Amino acid sequence: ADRTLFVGNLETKVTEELLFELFHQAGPVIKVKIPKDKDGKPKQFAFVNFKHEVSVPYAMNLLNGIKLYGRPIKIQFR
Amino acid sequence: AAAEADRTLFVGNLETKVTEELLFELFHQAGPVIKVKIPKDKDGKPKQFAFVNFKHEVSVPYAMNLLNGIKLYGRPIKIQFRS
Amino acid sequence: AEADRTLFVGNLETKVTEELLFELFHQAGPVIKVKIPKDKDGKPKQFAFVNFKHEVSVPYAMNLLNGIKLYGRPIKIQFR
Amino acid sequence: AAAAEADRTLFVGNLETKVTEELLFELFHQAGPVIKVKIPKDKDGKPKQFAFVNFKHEVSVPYAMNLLNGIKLYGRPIKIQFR
Amino acid sequence: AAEADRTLFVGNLETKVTEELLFELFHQAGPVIKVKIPKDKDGKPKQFAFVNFKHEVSVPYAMNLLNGIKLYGRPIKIQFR
């Protein structure tokens, strides 16, 4: 839980599979999770858990603000 | 089968000289393209927009980031996923 | 005459030669010829015509090279 | 010496608390071999919000300065300054 | 045969820029004959340089590629003669 990023401002069509492939460019990714509504539907953010800590500052610089389906993601850390 | 739609982009603000062949080669850089269509007038003219159908849906968010706003004969295209 | 594989390149610095433009635009595909017309007194003018072998080079070249600075002066590409 | 070490050392300020000497070594290594990196701690402590990066080759100094100045580490851009 | 068409003026130099640094930097535009940072009448380096390329094409290439680049925080100002 020290190598995890918060990716907000996600467009409705962004899936976990898309973010994994995107953040994998910053290093091996253990898993991605878009939390689902209390009644099943995705929320508009994901948690991206890297294997290595260095992927965190690398991923932020590399991908912060990148547009997915027109909407720029917002990366935060802790 | 009709999604097909999940893999289609609306490309607007097309210069009249842009051909279906050009868009194909252009959007092929984002992945395999199944078909491209520039709808036709009742006088055969272009309506200044097209539909690009990719094979994989990952190409969709990729083509957008990579081509949206690119100028074709001076006119910047406008890519929309559903339009 | 169906040679619309040709671009106009205005706003040329005095030191831009046909050789330079050929080499510069060759990055967008084979070039048949480049021309800088000379004026009434044998002096080159401030624009050029670049004729491509393939039409696809035109939209490519426009997007790739337009507004690039040669000797500090940005070229102004036009189709017709 | 220790002035030939002063002309091969850069001051890197506006650091995020999370930035470690290791991260900086790897980052500035992209501008050439790095002898040593030091984030000073004071009195307690503590530690400080800047770093000293000592290159082996003086050429790395203007290179790194022009290559890495202003890039964001954990959202905070680093401030490189030569002597 | 005094070719100034293959030489660039590089002004607004930081005092720590050397002829060796400008050589290696401008070499990225093609072979470089010589680089000169002139001296004043008292033998003190000036804050501009002359870069002589072997090929004229390096001129428009170099100044499009390197003009305004910061050396020790100071952007160089390239001018073609």
Which structural domain range is residue D46 located in? 1-83
Closest CA–CA distance from residue A57 to any residue of chain B (Å): 22
Q: How far is CA E40 from CA E36, E46, E48, E50, in A?
A: 13, 6, 11, 14
CATH number at residue E34: 3.30.70.330
Stated as kind and residue range, the H or E segment containing D29 is: helix D21-29
| Residues in Cβ contact with B31 at an 8 Å cutoff, skipping those fewer than 6 apart | B54, B55, B56, B58, B59, B62, B63
Instruction: Name all chains with 3 or more CB-CB pairs below 8 Å to chain D.
Output: A, E
Token output for B27: 């959007």
Enclosing H/E stretch for C49? strand C48-52
E30 touches E54 (CB < 8 A): yes
Chains E and A touch (3+ CB pairs under 8 A): no
Q: Which residues of A touch B58 (CB under 8 A)?
A: 18, 21
Closest-approach residue (CA) in chain C for B70: C63
In chain E, helix, strand, coil percent, each to 5? 25, 30, 45
H/E element, D48: none
Pull the structure tokens for residue D48: 């400080």
Q: For CA atoms D54, A51, A68, A38, give the dihedral sign.
A: negative
**Amino acid type, E23:** F
- Name the packing angle between helices B20-27 and B59-67 (round to 10°): 110
Alpha-carbon gap, residue A57 to E45, rounded angstroms = 43
| DSSP notation for chain B | ----STTEEEEES--TT--HHHHHHHHGGGS-EEEEE--B-SSS-B-SEEEEEESSTTHHHHHHHHHTT-EETTEE-EEES--
Q: D21-29 and D60-68 are packed helices; what angle lies between their axes, rounded to 10 degrees?
A: 110
By the 8 A CB rule, do A27 and A54 touch? yes
Resolution in units of Å: 2.5
Q: Does an interface of 3+ CB pairs under 8 Å exist between A and D?
A: yes
- Sort E22 into a burial class: Cβ within 10 Å, 0-12 / 13-18 / 19+: buried
Residues of B in contact with C79 (CB under 8 A): 73-74
**Number of domains present in the structure of chain E:** 1
Nearest residue on chain D to A56, judged by CA atoms? D74
Among chain A residues, CA nearest to D20:
A54
Residue with tokens 């169906």: C2
> What residues of C are in contact with residue E80 (Cβ under 8 Å)?
15, 71-72
What is the Cα–Cα distance from D70 to E1, expressed in whole angstroms?
A: 46
- In angstroms, the CA C80 to CA E62 distance is 31
How many C-beta atoms lie closer than 10 Å to residue E74's C-beta? Answer: 16
Q: E strand or H helix at D60, and its extent? A: helix D60-68
| Contact state of B22 with C59 under an 8 Å Cβ cutoff | yes
Rounded Cα distance, B12 and B81, in Å: 11
Q: Do C68 and E64 make contact, defined as CB atoms within 8 angstroms? A: yes
